[PDB]
């Protein structure tokens, strides 16, 4: 279980730490333009190993991805507060290509996990750039928000989060949405739970989603950047892949008809194991919610068209 | 987190051991009419603690339930061939009564976790005999079979069990049933799953439910008794209660209108915590499954009324 | 990580349950003369799997040990004399080792049958396997409990409590008080600094630890949860290649001045058996204790074959 | 189990993250000059909670230390003169400890800021708290990394590797090689039976552990994951009342021949602070090392005031 991390910034670095404290993977190679930073990170991270399970951590080069089972791409230049997102995508595409090409050439044949924002778009870019099978290229999608969303519903309703089933689908970002109609707690629909427990106000639920959806913006405002949350979810996804888990997570997967969408990566439940996506789940959507999914995909699709 | 286990037999003993190895509970008082066995089981289990989290395990008497947080009743009389299931209830009631009363006398005011068979019947009995609130008396119901049911579906569809939602409800036993219409994988129904994945055959799925439900029978015929599965299920429930989790489990809960049922304990998904049942989930059912529920519940009510009637009048 | 369990009695059964709950090994083949019991036991156990990590459990035959990584021998019937107990278990041991060896099994042997030290020496001779591929539970259990009790009494996390009970597991085993320490401080020195701790308490403690099994048997009819858990830990150290230090039954090639017999002492064990046998410096008295324990054992070993 | 972290820099921030992933404590209030950063940090960390055990994390003020069970001080700037660094951190410390004590805090102090030993003594002086209710990370991390390295070299599970790096955390800390042992066998004795392990590789290993922090700072700019992880483990020993043995910064009352200074030495810590200061048997040279580190420490500690 060898992982090659690409991007030793706030997200990549925190991600490796999470992997270390949580005991996921056996070998982690850190790659970043700035070599010295990663060498230091490797030594520092390694000094924490005596408190967790063993691991081998080192500053690596794209060539070291040859026998890697999972490549995590975090390195993604942030949008300047005064530029087209298209530019953000045009600058990250160059950053991206300079990463995928050299990684492919190493002989790497494992799973790609894209976390760089905008993720859905960059997952399509990675796929197109690598020429890898659709199921071997994945994006963090809306797994982090779905997790938080479930956790918040759980706290409000007071039921163990493990029994709260809800999904946030679409392009991870401003257009993502909650599948309220299908969301349920232990088998009972949120709708039925409210009818049965009026104290759980419908308006508060709605704001909660909004708070989950806008949180990354808020954090960047206060702290300047977001990383702990994304880093933890990135680790979980990494765990499901490496441990051939067959877990169901809302990832950025390749659309081929599901929800009627085609030729794009967007967020939807999916089964993921050591060989990438096994299944792409189509959750019964309300026609209204199908519009949501529709809007979200068209906006994302246009940008994808232009960029290329 | 103090636990008082009544019945140090195969189930009871296995349960304690599970609690020990899994690190659930801080204290475990073992109670059984046979004192020396509980004393040796206490010492024996304590030699395992160095390989797990600490715990205080000792031989106990009902009076020790005074400050307990949980009382686990596994003490039950086996059904020998040739006796009405009515007799099996009659003698188990006598037993239950010899346990409930003294525990209630100690001042115990925690939660009751009934595991004896028939569990639903013995749960309602414990509830009635103790006088405890309906939500402070729970049966292990169909939690084990549901957990085993899910893992098997998981293995067949090859999807992590955590994302496999399926319930087996009704009276734990020969007439419990799987709510196939509502069961789903990560949000996608079993029916829909079979449509997209034809390799997943329906006869195998239904046979698997039968193999699950009949598993206890086969275990007894080959080995004489069953304890590892239920013991492990019991410890999970115990953890849900003691750690105040608000976990959803198909347990034996008091029916007060749900499923059109009233005044009996029967299996159905419920939310449980340190104060007992918090919520009873009403999973949408098919007219038939609903009928199954009604039937499973009528026969249930019949045996209670018979057992309690005989016990109310003939006891001396 | 495939394990073959020979003996589905109270110990074997508990052992597997421990393995199931603790998540050790991915496959357990249970082997016992009573097929039905092993069959129902495998089904009961498997129902416990949804609450733990996955594993494959089934009623096996010695031949299933062909591709097994670990073979644990618990078999053996519990008013008997020990000499005539040893004899009926050497015979049983033979009926197990031979066929397991013929299946091609080139893994590790972990003997738990009693007397362990004697029967462990028997497995070695009966299988031919290298002195380091045949291991006995030794005194790992008693030491684990001995350390735990010192920790409670002393009120310091047991992980830092270092003590060993060595020699033949049983009546003649003894504690190495001289080398035993807390955080690195000898027990002796700890007692000086803290008089609240009494030698009478410490001395009776070892005794209680040592004769515990005797009482559990008297009270409950048999002991199994303790050794089961200890076997499970040993099983883990082997299957996961931990190179852990445990007082196991190891072959004597000079240590403590002993030779050609298995006996209890700290050793490093991993996926490939015992990696190292550790010699703890002993006190003259302690050397005697070890000496006396070994001679008493060696005689019984000598007359057995 | 509530905690008040003072300092939301790379170390405190990472500390909080570790605490969150490892699920230690149920409440963490992050206190730092820059509020918005501690505010956006708490939101960010709270988004990770769904993947771990529950916790209540928030931006706090010194006043929130009132009911706190433990306060962790990581504030303190990272050219520089050993003297100047101490003198300005002593100032920072004063602007923190005072206000925290004013809140009503009657819990434990865990000092992580460097130079840790000196800043720990300062915390004791400034807080007026009991000697046992003021703790410094001391050499716990280096000792932990030191043991792990010896284990990888000797190929024996680290839990069985007992070694101690003592003295003032810094350039003057030294390894107690004489007492260091593996499963009860001495490093010196271990080497004898294992030629391939050379005292040359062993001395260089320690030196790497000691000056590693320095290499990390040059390469990356700062060091935080090692210290943060270690802080979280000490925090766990305290919040869970473990009575764990860790080389911490503790008040010397004659032990080792030292008096009236905090310095690195094995100790038992729990919910109520330091239970015991362990005095490990030092060689003449190892004893000289302790004196040298302490006298030099004492010097810098005096001038500082």
Curated annotation (Swiss-Prot), chain A:
The modification Phosphotyrosine is found at residue 217. Pathway: Fermentation; pyruvate fermentation to lactate; (S)-lactate from pyruvate: step 1/1. NAD(+) binds at residues 11, 32, 37, 62, 76-77, 98, 115-117, 140. Keywords: Allosteric enzyme, Cytoplasm, NAD, Oxidoreductase, Phosphoprotein. GO terms for biological process: glycolytic process; lactate metabolic process. It catalyses: (S)-lactate + NAD(+) = pyruvate + NADH + H(+). This is L-lactate dehydrogenase. Allosterically activated by fructose 1,6-bisphosphate (FBP) alone under acidic conditions, while it requires additional activation factors such as divalent cations (Mn(2+)) under neutral conditions. Under acidic conditions, Mn(2+) is an inhibitor in the absence of fructose 1,6-bisphosphate (FBP). In case of L.casei, L-LDH binds four fructose 1,6-bisphosphate (FBP) molecules per tetramer, while usual allosteric L-LDH binds only two fructose 1,6-bisphosphate (FBP) molecules per tetramer. Signal peptide: none annotated. The keyword Magnesium does not apply. SUPFAM superfamilies: LDH C-terminal domain-like, NAD(P)-binding Rossmann-fold domains. Disulfide bonds: none annotated. Thermostable up to 50 degrees Celsius. Thermostabilized in the presence of both fructose 1,6-bisphosphate (FBP) and Mn(2+) ions. Beta-D-fructose 1,6-bisphosphate binds at residues 150, 162-165. Its EC number is 1.1.1.27. Belongs to the LDH/MDH superfamily. LDH family. One of its GO terms (cellular component) is cytoplasm. The gene is ldh.
Curated annotation (Swiss-Prot), chains C, D:
Substrate binds at residues 82, 114-117, 142-145, 223. The active site is at 169 (proton acceptor). Pathway: Fermentation; pyruvate fermentation to lactate; (S)-lactate from pyruvate: step 1/1. GO terms for biological process: glycolytic process; lactate metabolic process. It is found in: Cytoplasm. Keywords: Allosteric enzyme, Cytoplasm, NAD, Oxidoreductase, Phosphoprotein. Transmembrane segments: none annotated. Changing residue 162 to D: Shows a lower thermoresistance than the wild-type, even in the absence of fructose 1,6-bisphosphate (FBP). Not thermostabilized in the presence of fructose 1,6-bisphosphate (FBP), Mn(2+) or both. Signal peptide: none annotated. It comes from the Bacteria. It holds the Pfam family Ldh_1_C. The modification Phosphotyrosine is found at residue 214. Homotetramer. The lineage of its organism: Bacteria, Bacillati, Bacillota, Bacilli, Lactobacillales. One of its GO terms (molecular function) is L-lactate dehydrogenase activity. The gene is ldh. It catalyses: (S)-lactate + NAD(+) = pyruvate + NADH + H(+). It is an enzyme of class 1 (oxidoreductase). This is L-lactate dehydrogenase. NAD(+) binds at residues 11, 32, 37, 62, 76-77, 95, 112-114, 137. InterPro entries: L-lactate/malate_DH, L-lactate_DH, L-lactate_DH_AS, Lactate/malate_DH_C, Lactate/malate_DH_N, Lactate_DH/Glyco_Ohase_4_C, NAD(P)-bd_dom_sf. Beta-D-fructose 1,6-bisphosphate binds at residues 147, 159-162. Catalyzes the conversion of lactate to pyruvate. Its EC number is 1.1.1.27. SUPFAM superfamilies: LDH C-terminal domain-like (SSF56327), NAD(P)-binding Rossmann-fold domains (SSF51735). Belongs to the LDH/MDH superfamily. LDH family. Thermostable up to 50 degrees Celsius. Thermostabilized in the presence of both fructose 1,6-bisphosphate (FBP) and Mn(2+) ions.
């Amino acid at each position: 279980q060898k992982v090659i991390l690409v991007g030793d910034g706030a997200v990549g670095s925190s991600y490796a730490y999470a992997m270390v404290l949580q005991g996921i993977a056996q070998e982690i190679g850190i790659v970043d333009i700035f070599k010295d930073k990663t060498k230091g990170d490797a030594i520092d991270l390694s000094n924490a190993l005596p408190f967790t399970s063993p691991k081998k951590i080192y500053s690596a080069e794209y060539s070291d991805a040859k026998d890697a089972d999972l490549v995590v791409i975090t390195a993604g230049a942030p949008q300047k507060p005064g530029e087209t997102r298209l530019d953000l995508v045009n600058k990250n595409l160059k950053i991206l290509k300079s990463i995928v090409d050299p990684i492919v050439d190493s002989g790497f044949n494992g799973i790609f996990l894209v976390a760089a924002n905008p993720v859905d778009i960059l997952t399509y870019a990675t796929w197109k750039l690598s020429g890898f099978p659709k199921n071997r290229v994945v994006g963090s999608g809306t797994s982090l928000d779905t997790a938080r969303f479930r956790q918040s519903i759980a706290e409000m309703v007071n039921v163990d989060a493990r029994s709260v089933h809800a999904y946030i689908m679409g392009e991870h970002g401003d257009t993502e949405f909650p599948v309220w109609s299908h969301a349920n707690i232990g088998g009972v629909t949120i709708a039925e739970w409210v009818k049965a427990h009026p104290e759980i106000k419908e308006d508060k639920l709605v704001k909660m989603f909004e708070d989950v959806r806008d949180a990354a913006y808020e954090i960047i405002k206060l702290k300047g950047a977001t990383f702990y949350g994304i880093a933890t979810a990135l680790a979980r996804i990494s765990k499901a892949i490496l441990n051939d888990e067959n877990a169901v997570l809302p990832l950025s997967v390749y659309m081929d008809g599901q929800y009627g969408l085609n030729d794009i990566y967007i967020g939807t439940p999916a089964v993921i194991n050591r060989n990438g996506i096994q299944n792409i789940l189509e959750i019964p959507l309300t026609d209204h919610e199908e519009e949501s999914m529709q809007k979200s995909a068209s906006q994302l699709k246009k940008v994808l068209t232009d960029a290329f």
